[PDB]
Structure 1
Amino acid sequence: MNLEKPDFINVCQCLIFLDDPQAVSDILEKLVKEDNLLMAYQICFDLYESASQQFLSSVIQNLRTDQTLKMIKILSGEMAIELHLQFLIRNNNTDLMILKNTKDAVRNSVCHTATVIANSFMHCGTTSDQFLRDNLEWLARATNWAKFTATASLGVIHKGHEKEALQLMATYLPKDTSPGSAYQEGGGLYALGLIHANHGGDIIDYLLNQLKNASNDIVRHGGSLGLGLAAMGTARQDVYDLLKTNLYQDDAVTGEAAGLALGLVMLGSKNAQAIEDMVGYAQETQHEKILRGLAVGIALVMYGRMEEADALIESLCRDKDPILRRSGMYTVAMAYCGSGNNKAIRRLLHVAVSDVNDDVRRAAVESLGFILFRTPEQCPSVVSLLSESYNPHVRYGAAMALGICCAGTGNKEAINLLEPMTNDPVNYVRQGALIASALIMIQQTEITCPKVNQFRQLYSKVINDKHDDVMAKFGAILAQGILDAGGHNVTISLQSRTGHTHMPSVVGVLVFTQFWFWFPLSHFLSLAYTPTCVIGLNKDLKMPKVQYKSNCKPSTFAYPAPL
């Protein structure tokens, strides 16, 4: 600041690493005073895209207590949402042929639902219904819990299409068309949850009413996932009360729904009351489902707190009940996210090599990714040797730790290790290796890494074979949708543009891997797709036309797969 000019770099990095919202609000006001508006706009866009929630709240409150409108709107995110949607809706150009093929090849097993998940991945954010519209006598073949997944899927197609949300959903008349199903009502609230992620906006005060009245079996499951999604990270006490009361009702199917949602709102708050109440209800209960909920719901309460969490860890890690020990491993994962701290590695390896119960060995070795992704060149050096242990669970964990460590970039050694494993005798480890490869190779063309056209064909082999195990082709038909996400226009990364760890992405991809225990959780991956584009602008209101020019390209890179 003593230097000649104010700037971004100091105010971008230091004031949010230091968490000094007053200082940034002051320098922002000063930059308004001398009428240098372009700096004051660029700083807002730079800030929103990498500042935490609630930090924005204190900044906006200190500020407002004209330029006010055009700075508040760009500060809360509204036009960033608008612009992103407007990019995806125009650059969409998915190829329907693959869906037509897999649809024709499917037999009437579980793979049916595995189609309608992957479909929603590729048309994500694109607001286009075509594959669910041109045929319907086929989609009506779904029944029971499947109807919950399929009707939830609309929520990931219309991601961010916030403005009209409610009118759209009732436009399907889910409640009026027949009272003969509760699964549709159960799905509706889940879809509203997916559309408004983080932006609880108005809809919190609508869901909070709608959850009050319930055919308590299913409607409360949908409702609590939706409400736990819309309001995440805000620590709002009035919500927490209602989720606690639903949890204490002690019902299996309503268990882990609240078990998660009560964890999302408190995220990172370290709240010393919630931890003691939740761990106290995890002991001395007798339904596994509720434990499989709280196994996640606990860990998210601590986040980046690092050493200031240790005390809970070496308590929770001693418990006899295995689900608690697994949740201990998830907690030591989230505590140190991105931070290559050695002793956490030492613990995770000791557990993975020693413990007697396989699921904690999986969840141990799997979490190595979350604490190493700052240096993806290093992950293969450690996980490689694990990939040959005799018991399958450790192999599955290894494959997924690779998929989650190197996620964004086609690092060659990872593919080099995954190649042999795609033909492991044990079905579910093939299910693992396929999805890991698909994550790690999103948007890669042959010139940028060589192996792609191996894998792009291999899936269509498996999915068309008929002498194979169902779960393998499940993993394949999911990988298709992973590889062509959002009309090729979106990518997965945990690092932010400038070195910050983007929390929604970590949360979404962590809670994705639970697809092992409950299928409708797989949609939670959609939080991780970030658009990958440059927006030309000259005034917030004004996108003027320009042509950029990309040198040193034969023009054979970029948009792939027309053929």
Structure 2
Amino acid sequence: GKGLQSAIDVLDPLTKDPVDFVRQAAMIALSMILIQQTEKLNPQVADINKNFLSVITNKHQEGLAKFGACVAQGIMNAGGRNVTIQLENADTGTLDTKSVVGLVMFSQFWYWFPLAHFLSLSFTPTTVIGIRGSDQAIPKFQMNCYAKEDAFSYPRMYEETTARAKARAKKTYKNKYSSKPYKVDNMTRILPQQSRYISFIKDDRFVPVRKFKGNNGVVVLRDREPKEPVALIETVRQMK
């Protein structure tokens, strides 16, 4: 999920070598570095997806490569594209035991294909979610993002009269503090790269209980208008 370039440069020869299962492993890994990455974020992203489509097509490929490309497409476009793999924890320093166990398990699918589903353990959502805190209810409120809107967006869908008479006679990349902040609703995809640029509004019915630290966690706000009602996004548990 770090999207480190040097790893991609090193992996580029691996995904093109004659040996098929190495190609499978390289394709699976390359989809683990660029998870939740758009073409705008990095130019190489689109060509990798084109290579995935080519290997899925072009039936003259080994079955190992086909499986690798299919699983790489599954990982790269993770669940709703709204979830990332974070072996490292949040602002603190932790291994996040669940993710490490899941990824060790996912590395074990060389002797049991069913174990490949264990990678769903390490899937962590990317959200800056706000709650009232007085009753643990999700409110609706916009937030400022000081970056270009053209970067942290979902990638596009899969696509496949004599003078007139004489007139014809002669005819023969940083995105760093781009200003102009644009509103982002609560409960929306916040990439870890863009999470640092996320800011609240100084004036609002809700103000954060602390100073936002640019992570992908939960932030409790403070109701400055404890009498008026505002629209609440209802959680799945709430309607029963």
Query: If the TM-score is normalised by the length of the shorter chain, which range does it land in?
Result: 0.5 to 0.7
Amino acid at match of 1:513: S
In structure 1, what is the Cα distance between the partners aligned to 2:52 and 2:66? Answer: 8
In structure 1, what is the Cα distance between the partners aligned to 2:54 and 2:9? Answer: 20
Q: Structure with the greater relative contact order (CA < 8 A, sep ≥ 6): 1 or 2?
A: 2
In structure 1, what is the Cα distance between the partners aligned to 2:44 and 2:155? Answer: 14
Residue 227 (structure 2) aligns with: none
In structure 2, what is the Cα distance between the partners aligned to 1:494 and 1:442? Answer: 13
Residue 460 (structure 1) aligns with: 53
Structure 1 residues 478, 520: CA separation in 2 closer, same or farther (over 3 Å shift)?
Answer: same
The structure in which a higher percent of residues are strand is 2
In structure 1, what is the Cα distance between the partners aligned to 2:153 and 2:144? Answer: 14
Query: Among 111, 132, 140, which residue is 1:538 paired with?
Result: 132
Deviations 1:416-471 (A, max 9, x none): 11112111111111111100100010011223222001101001111111211111
In structure 2, what is the Cα distance between the partners aligned to 1:481 and 1:506? Answer: 20
Mapped contact 2:39–2:155 kept (Cα < 8 A): no
Q: Structure 1 residue 439 and structure 2 residue 37: aligned?
A: no
Deviations 1:192-215 (A, max 9, x none): xxxxxxxxxxxxxxxxxxxxxxxx
Residue 113 (structure 2) aligns with: 519
Mapped contact 2:17–2:23 kept (Cα < 8 A): yes
Deviation at 1:496, TM superposition (A): 1.2
Deviations 1:338-390 (A, max 9, x none): xxxxxxxxxxxxxxxxxxxxxxxxxxxxxxxxxxxxxxxxxxxxxxxxxxxxx
Q: Structure 1 residue 478 and structure 2 residue 78: aligned?
A: no
2:75 counterpart SS class? helix
In structure 2, what is the Cα distance between the partners aligned to 1:516 and 1:442? Answer: 22
1:536 counterpart SS class? strand
In structure 1, what is the Cα distance between the partners aligned to 2:31 and 2:11? Answer: 11
Q: Structure 1 residue 488 and structure 2 residue 81: aligned?
A: yes
Deviation at 1:415, TM superposition (A): 0.7
Deviation at 1:511, TM superposition (A): 1.1
Q: What is the aligned length?
A: 156
Deviation at 1:409, TM superposition (A): 1.2
Q: How does 1:9-408 map to 2 (within 5 A)?
A: 408=1
The structure in which a higher percent of residues are helix is 1
Query: Among 502, 510, 520, which residue is 2:96 paired with?
Result: 502
2:152 counterpart SS class? coil
Mapped contact 2:84–2:124 kept (Cα < 8 A): yes
In structure 1, what is the Cα distance between the partners aligned to 2:140 and 2:106? Answer: 39
Amino acid at match of 1:491: T
Residue 413 (structure 1) aligns with: 6
Mapped contact 2:99–2:121 kept (Cα < 8 A): yes
Percent identical across equivalent pairs?
50
In structure 1, what is the Cα distance between the partners aligned to 2:18 and 2:142? Answer: 52
CA RMSD of aligned residues (A): 1.3
Residue 203 (structure 2) aligns with: none
Residue 215 (structure 2) aligns with: none
In structure 2, what is the Cα distance between the partners aligned to 1:556 and 1:447? Answer: 5
Residue 153 (structure 2) aligns with: 558
Amino acid at match of 1:464: T
Amino acid at match of 2:140: K
1:413 counterpart SS class? helix
Deviation at 1:510, TM superposition (A): 0.4
Give TM-score, length-normalised by structure 1.
Answer: 0.27
In structure 1, what is the Cα distance between the partners aligned to 2:61 and 2:132? Answer: 56
Find runs of 4+ consecutive structure 1 residues off by over 2 angstroms: 554-558
Deviations 1:118-177 (A, max 9, x none): xxxxxxxxxxxxxxxxxxxxxxxxxxxxxxxxxxxxxxxxxxxxxxxxxxxxxxxxxxxx
Deviations 1:475-505 (A, max 9, x none): 0011010001110100001111121220000
Residue 450 (structure 1) aligns with: 43
1:481 counterpart SS class? helix
Structure 1 residues 549, 541: CA separation in 2 closer, same or farther (over 3 Å shift)?
Answer: same
In structure 1, what is the Cα distance between the partners aligned to 2:66 and 2:84? Answer: 24
In structure 2, what is the Cα distance between the partners aligned to 1:556 and 1:521? Answer: 35
1:516 counterpart SS class? coil
Deviation at 1:552, TM superposition (A): 2.4
1:478 counterpart SS class? helix
1:477 counterpart SS class? helix
In structure 2, what is the Cα distance between the partners aligned to 1:495 and 1:486? Answer: 20
Amino acid at match of 1:488: R
In structure 2, what is the Cα distance between the partners aligned to 1:559 and 1:538? Answer: 28
In structure 1, what is the Cα distance between the partners aligned to 2:127 and 2:93? Answer: 18
Query: Among 418, 427, 434, which residue is 2:20 paired with?
Result: 427
Deviation at 1:536, TM superposition (A): 1.2
Deviation at 1:410, TM superposition (A): 1.0
2:72 counterpart SS class? helix
Deviations 1:36-60 (A, max 9, x none): xxxxxxxxxxxxxxxxxxxxxxxxx
Q: Which runs of 5+ in 2 are unaligned?
A: 159-240
Q: Which runs of 5+ in 1 are unaligned?
A: 1-407
